[PDB]
Write an enzyme that holds these catalytic residues in place. Structure first.
Site, short mmCIF file in Angstrom:
data_model
loop_
_atom_site.label_atom_id
_atom_site.label_comp_id
_atom_site.label_asym_id
_atom_site.label_seq_id
_atom_site.Cartn_x
_atom_site.Cartn_y
_atom_site.Cartn_z
N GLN A 145 -15.83 -4.89 19.49
CA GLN A 145 -16.78 -4.16 20.35
C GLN A 145 -17.41 -3.04 19.58
O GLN A 145 -16.79 -2.46 18.67
CB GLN A 145 -16.09 -3.54 21.55
CG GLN A 145 -15.78 -4.51 22.65
CD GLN A 145 -15.54 -3.78 23.96
OE1 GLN A 145 -15.17 -4.40 24.96
NE2 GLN A 145 -15.74 -2.47 23.95
N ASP A 175 0.98 -3.63 -6.36
CA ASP A 175 0.09 -4.22 -5.34
C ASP A 175 -0.88 -3.17 -4.82
O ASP A 175 -0.71 -2.66 -3.70
CB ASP A 175 0.92 -4.77 -4.16
CG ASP A 175 0.11 -5.68 -3.24
OD1 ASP A 175 0.67 -6.18 -2.22
OD2 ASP A 175 -1.09 -5.88 -3.53
N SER A 219 -1.97 -5.65 5.84
CA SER A 219 -1.96 -5.47 4.38
C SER A 219 -3.01 -4.49 3.89
O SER A 219 -4.11 -4.48 4.43
CB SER A 219 -2.25 -6.79 3.66
OG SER A 219 -1.03 -7.55 3.44
N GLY A 220 -2.66 -3.68 2.90
CA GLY A 220 -3.65 -2.78 2.36
C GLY A 220 -3.78 -1.47 3.11
O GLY A 220 -4.30 -0.48 2.57
N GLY A 269 -2.75 -9.12 8.57
CA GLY A 269 -3.95 -8.33 8.86
C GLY A 269 -3.70 -6.82 8.64
O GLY A 269 -4.66 -6.05 8.62
N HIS A 285 -3.41 -7.79 -3.35
CA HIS A 285 -3.46 -9.18 -2.87
C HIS A 285 -4.54 -9.43 -1.84
O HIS A 285 -4.80 -10.57 -1.48
CB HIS A 285 -2.13 -9.71 -2.30
CG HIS A 285 -1.72 -9.11 -0.98
ND1 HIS A 285 -0.93 -7.99 -0.87
CD2 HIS A 285 -2.03 -9.48 0.30
CE1 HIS A 285 -0.76 -7.68 0.41
NE2 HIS A 285 -1.42 -8.56 1.14
#
Lengths: 240, 11
Positions: free
Chosen positions: A64, A93, A188-189, A186, A45
């Protein structure tokens, strides 16, 4: 990661930040695991659309210059053929990203170790989720890589009515659900790293949480079970 | 809800 602590720079060298072109810059959108010097494993996704992606390895602080990053474009994306964008709860997924160049390995950049195919962890197995995802539900991304201890919740428990019920599949790993620590937008994966026979290996690809919030008691973060796709992963890499 | 930032449906 809600309820996380800042990871030391060299604790999770396979963790990557998948970013997409936004305005005139790049924006972190998902995590991923480097599995070959030129292949990253992430959630379908996250790469389901038409965005422009770059992978950052050796990344610690998104805002940074760490003096350790390598930036590399994504030349090809292979999403699992059975992935259905309209039903993330159906599973599959997972996607593999072939990088434009091989990255160089060092203490900040290493391959994530994959579990043996078919491995299912005992309930309450020790694992850690890592990522730059939100630090609170409806909050903001972390600036520095975070980690949080998230023990697994086996299928029998995860699939019970007070937890995820029918939503979880045996092709997934559930972890956490303590009301305090969880994956959040943020993450995910990204990897779920679990300690097995003394070695941490990446057993999950971060997929989803409750519609009610990131850290919701008895709604553990759900991950794609890496061990269910070892043959798929090897077939893709062998053919690209 | 999937965990893509800002959202699954909104990067």
């Amino acid at each position: 990661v809600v309820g996380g602590t800042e990871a030391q720079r060299n604790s999770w060298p396979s963790q990557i930040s998948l970013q997409y072109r936004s305005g005139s810059s790049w924006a972190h959108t998902c995590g991923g695991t480097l599995i070959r010097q030129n292949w990253v494993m992430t959630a379908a996704h996250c790469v389901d659309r038409e965005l422009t992606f770059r992978v950052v390895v050796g990344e610690h602080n998104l805002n940074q210059n760490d003096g350790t990053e390598q930036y590399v474009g994504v030349q090809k994306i292979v999403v699992h053929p059975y992935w259905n964008t309209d039903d993330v709860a159906a599973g599959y997924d997972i996607a593999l990203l072939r990088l434009a160049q091989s990255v160089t390995l060092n203490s900040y950049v290493q391959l994530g170790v994959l579990p043996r195919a078919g491995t299912i962890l005992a309930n309450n197995s020790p694992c850690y989720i890592t990522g730059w995802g939100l630090t609170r539900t409806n909050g903001q991304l972390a600036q520095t890589l975070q980690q949080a201890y998230l023990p697994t919740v086996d299928y029998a428990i995860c699939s019970s009515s007070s937890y995820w019920g029918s939503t979880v599949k045996n092709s997934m790993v559930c972890a956490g659900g303590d009301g305090v620590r969880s994956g959040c937008q943020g993450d995910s994966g990204g990897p779920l790293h679990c300690l097995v026979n003394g070695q941490y290996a990446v057993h999950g690809v971060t997929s989803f949480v409750s519609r009610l919030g990131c850290n919701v008691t008895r709604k553990p973060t759900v991950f794609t079970r890496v061990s269910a796709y070892i043959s798929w992963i090897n077939n893709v890499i062998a053919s690209n | 809800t999937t965990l893509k930032f800002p959202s699954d449906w909104d990067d």
